Amino acid sequence: SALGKLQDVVNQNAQALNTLVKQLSSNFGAISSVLNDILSRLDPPEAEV
């Protein structure tokens, strides 16, 4: 495992992209994390918030 630095930068970029993709599962205080649900079972006045 001589090439430590290179693998470090690869792992860091993959980790950043993976946590960015994972941040889509968060509710952030909403009623559901996915958008199509909070659009399919709410009125525009509250789907807005």
Binding site: I31, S40, R41, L42, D43, E46
Partner: protein, 50 residues
């Protein structure tokens, strides 16, 4: 039933038309929370409790 012994009936395995009962003006107050009344028809749910 009495309020303290509220009667609960499970509802499943049926096609349920909320639109017709909502259209009837017999019900004085119709408040749906977390779900929109108009789009109630489109949704599908595991089961209902009445």
């Amino acid at each position: 039933a009495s309020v303290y012994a509220w009667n609960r009936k499970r509802i499943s395995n049926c096609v349920a038309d909320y639109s017709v009962l909502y259209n009837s003006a017999s019900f004085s107050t119709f408040k749906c929370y977390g779900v929109s009344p108009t789009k109630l028809n489109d949704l599908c749910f595991t089961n209902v409790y009445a």
